[PDB]
Amino acid sequence: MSRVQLALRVPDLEASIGFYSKLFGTGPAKVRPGYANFAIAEPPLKLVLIEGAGEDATRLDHLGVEVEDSAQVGHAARRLKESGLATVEENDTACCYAVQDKVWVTGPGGEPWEVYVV
Ligand SMILES: [Cl-]
Ligand code: NI
């Protein structure tokens, strides 16, 4: 029961929050200065909105896969590693007054993915 995380850097956080609330029929789960996120049940999605500074267009910030528990992150980190991808693991972190275990991989064209648990 994992779900994709889509993180967008948006030029207008307030406008984006309103648009996404309408699109998914649900308000944001978390709102902070320059930051919001939506936990969408259907489609299963963690949508993250980060306000850009003086930006003109929405762009991809990063992608991810949100899993249930640390064991799944661990399983993923091992699996990705064995597949031959370069991974960077984080454990028991800090950011967003929250705690996360995660593993980062980067695609060929530079798009970064985190497999993580909140
Ligand atoms: Cl995955
Ligand atoms: Ni993220």
From Swiss-Prot:
Effect recorded for residue 102 to A: Nearly inactive. High decrease in iron affinity
Domain VOC: 2-118
GO biological process: response to cadmium ion
EC assignment: 1.13.11.-
Temperature dependence: Exhibits robust catalytic activity from 37 to 55 degrees Celsius.
GO molecular function terms listed in the Swiss-Prot or TrEMBL record: dioxygenase activity; metal ion binding
Binding positions (roxarsone (III)): 61, 95-96
Catalyses which reaction(s): methylarsonous acid + AH2 + O2 = arsenite + methanol + A + H(+); roxarsone (III) + AH2 + O2 = 4-hydroxy-3-nitrocyclohexa-2,5-dien-1-one + arsenite + A + H(+); nitarsone (III) + AH2 + O2 = 4-nitrocyclohexa-2,5-dien-1-one + arsenite + A + H(+); 4-aminophenylarsonous acid + AH2 + O2 = 4-aminocyclohexa-2,5-dien-1-one + arsenite + A
Cofactors demanded by this protein: Fe(2+)
Lineage top rank: taxon: Bacteria
Residues at which Fe(2+) binds: 5, 62, 114
Effect annotated for changing residue 100 to A: Retains less than 5% of wild-type catalytic activity
Effect of residue 102 to E: Nearly inactive. High decrease in iron affinity
Keywords: Dioxygenase, Iron, Metal-binding, Oxidoreductase
Note in the entry: Organoarsenicals are used as herbicides, pesticides, antimicrobial growth promoters, and chemical warfare agents. Arsenic is the most widespread environmental toxin and is classified as a Group 1 human carcinogen.
Function of the protein: Nonheme iron-dependent dioxygenase that can break carbon-arsenic bonds, playing a role in the detoxification of environmental organoarsenical compounds. Catalyzes the oxygen-dependent demethylation of highly toxic methylarsonous acid (MAs(III)) to arsenite, which can then be exported out of the cell. Can also cleave the C-As bond in several trivalent aromatic arsenicals, including roxarsone (III), nitarsone (III) and (4-aminophenyl)arsonous acid.
Record note on quaternary structure: Monomer.
Domain remarks: The thiolates of the vicinal cysteine pair (Cys95-Cys96) directly coordinate the arsenic atom of the organoarsenical substrate.
Record protein name field: Trivalent organoarsenical cleaving enzyme
Gene: arsI
Coverage span on the entire protein: 1 to 118 of 151
